[PDB]
Symmetry: C2
Subunit: 125 residues, 2 copies
């Protein structure tokens, strides 16, 4: 069960993995039976196979940039939240998306649940 | 009347305004009667307006707390939103800043049903 400082580290690395687009390293940060709700409000994705398919589709050939826009907030029960921005172009016009991610880690330092808050009101193009 | 994403951004932005001014009463008014609060997340939750009101009395009550948004409010389509903000106050006899992230869920009447605040000592900064 990751300490507060370890959570900050695990989460910062996660944005780094998204920014570079290493899909396989991203999937390995998740527990084998992790759950993903992105966007929060829609039905959750379950398991690495489904999570992998989700990322291969989203970060696939997309060429995306992602960066923390503020410090990672972490608690003492293996949970944390962070604000970040996702930028693309694919259309000639710069597009941005502001998101806040909430994660709960397990006793092995793997992501058990992940929830991303954002909607169309967070798009800026 | 479950708030839309845009209404959530408004409600949450308003919440911080009240915390800044210090209107403790206007804040408790925003919570539903059987609302739940977890601040900081990881601690046992407080149930009911009574406890909640008692809670804010202790915290915001004593101390000239200051607070501002540090980024836009993220909002879902099912009455939930999350936002990042900073709190400024006097900690253990020193000027300090606290970086926080709040997660809220509203009910069918625009009242806060659940509130969870993420922060720890790792989010504490001097001056």
């Amino acid at each position: 069960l990751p300490t507060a400082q370890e959570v900050q580290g695990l989460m910062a690395r996660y944005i780094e993995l998204v920014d570079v687009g290493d899909i396989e390293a991203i999937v390995q940060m998740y527990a084998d039976d992790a759950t993903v709700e992105d966007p929060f409000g829609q039905p959750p994705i379950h398991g690495r196979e489904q999570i992998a398919a989700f990322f291969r589709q989203g970060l696939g050939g997309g060429k995306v940039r992602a960066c923390l826009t503020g410090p990672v907030r972490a608690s003492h029960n293996g949970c944390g939240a962070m604000p970040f921005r996702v930028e693309m172009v694919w259309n000639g016009q710069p597009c941005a998306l502001d998101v806040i991610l909430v994660m709960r880690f397990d006793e092995h330092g793997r992501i058990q649940t992940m929830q991303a808050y954002w909607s169309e009101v967070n798009l800026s193009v």
